[PDB]
Amino acid sequence: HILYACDSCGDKFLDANSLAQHVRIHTAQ
Ligand SMILES: [Zn+2]
């Protein structure tokens, strides 16, 4: 379930792989 979260934007991921890559999409364009 909600194991990982992208802070600042408050994104709630059930995936870790998608979470971490999501914090990547923030560094990227
Ligand atoms: Zn985010």
Curated annotation (Swiss-Prot):
Tissue: Expressed in germinal center B-cells.
Identification of the protein by name: Zinc finger and BTB domain-containing protein 17
The protein's assembly and partners: Homooligomerizes (via the BTB/POZ domain), multimerization is required for DNA binding. Interacts (via the C-terminal zinc fingers) with GIF1; the interaction results in the recruitment of MYB to the CDKN1A/p21 and CDKN1B promoters and repression of transcription. Interacts with TRAF2, interfering with the binding of UBC13 to TRAF2, and inhibiting TRAF2 E3 ligase activity. Interacts with MYC (via the C-terminal helix-loop-helix motif); the interaction inhibits ZBTB17 transactivation and growth arrest activities and renders it insoluble in the nucleus.
Residues represented out of the complete protein: 714 to 742 of 803
Domain of life the protein comes from: Eukaryota
Mapped zinc finger ranges (C2H2-type): 4-26
Subcellular location per the Swiss-Prot or TrEMBL entry: Nucleus
Record-stated family: Belongs to the krueppel C2H2-type zinc-finger protein family.
Role of this protein: Transcription factor that can function as an activator or repressor depending on its binding partners, and by targeting negative regulators of cell cycle progression. Plays a critical role in early lymphocyte development, where it is essential to prevent apoptosis in lymphoid precursors, allowing them to survive in response to IL7 and undergo proper lineage commitment. Has been shown to bind to the promoters of adenovirus major late protein and cyclin D1 and activate transcription. Required for early embryonic development during gastrulation.
